[PDB]
Write a protein that binds this ligand. Structure first.
Ligand code: CA
Ligand code: CA
Ligand code: CA
Ligand code: CA
Length: 149
């Protein structure tokens, strides 16, 4: 579908600690969202269960780059009886000094995820020994929101 860029993040889930850790690592080949410029990307994470947004986090903003590096870690309290139902939604947006920020693209992993998104989630569930990083193709916001609704 649309060439919007790719996002790399790691996942780890430790049931005895009830802790899900998501590290936003880097993105690549992001779409330009500023006329006569590049983009000023930041990343949002939503933790969702049953269509309800339970937690939200945001990375810092990187100026003028289509290939940002973050290495920003976020942790979430998720008990073992809930982990199978959660969705981790990752959105890359372009910060604008004036007006609304511009969503570049979005992806989710977790309950009801598909393809490489499901694979990453499954790998996390099987291997709490270490964080597992994987790249993900960004999709247009409208498409992902439809799959989450
Ligand atoms: Ca813009
Ligand atoms: Ca800026
Ligand atoms: Ca901008
Ligand atoms: Ca704007």
């Amino acid at each position: 579908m649309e060439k919007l860029g790719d996002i790399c993040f790691s996942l780890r889930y430790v049931p005895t600690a009830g802790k899900l850790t998501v590290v936003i690592l880097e993105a690549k080949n992001l779409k330009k969202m500023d006329v006569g410029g590049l983009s000023d990307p930041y990343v949002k994470i939503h933790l969702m269960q049953n269509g309800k947004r339970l937690k939200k986090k945001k990375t810092t903003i990187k100026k003028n780059t289509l290939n940002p590096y973050y290495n920003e870690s976020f942790s979430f309290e998720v008990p073992f009886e809930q982990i199978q139902k959660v969705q981790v939604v990752v959105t890359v947006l372009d910060y604008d000094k004036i007006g609304k920020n511009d969503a570049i693209g979005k992806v989710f992993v977790g309950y009801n995820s598909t393809g490489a998104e499901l694979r990453h989630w499954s790998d996390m569930l099987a291997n709490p020994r270490r964080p597992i990083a994987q790249w993900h193709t960004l999709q247009v916001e409208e498409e992902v929101d439809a799959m989450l609704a």
